[PDB]
C-alpha cells in the first residue's frame, strides 16, 4: 500500500506548530521527521526558535512576531502562517500531494 503519508497539524498552545505525519510504513517520516528539524533550521524563518522530532511528529517552535510580519490576508492565525513557510520546504518531500492548507 502506497500512499503521500497522512500528516495533521495540529496548534502547539500559543505560537506554536506541531505536524504528525504517518507511520508503521512510513520510514519516510520515520527518517525525514528526524531531518526535518534540521530540515527547518537550514531553510528558516527569521522567527525559528526551535523544532524537535517526535519520532513520526515535528513539534515546531518559533516566534510569532515574525509570523505576524507575514499572515497574509486569509491567514487567520499566526502558525497558520507558518505552516506555509514549511510546507513549501515540506511538501516537496511527499505531502505536496496534499497540502494541509
Known sequence: GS?????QIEQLGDSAMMIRFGEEIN?????????????????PFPGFIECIPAFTSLTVFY???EVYKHLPQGISSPFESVKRDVEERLAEIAEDYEVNR
Open 3 to 7: 500512499m503521500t503519508v497522512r500528516y
Open 63 to 65: 516566534d510569532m512576531y
Open 27 to 43: 520510514e519516510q517520516v520515520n527518517g525525514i521527521v528526524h531531518a526535518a528539524a534540521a530540515y527547518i533550521e537550514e531553510q
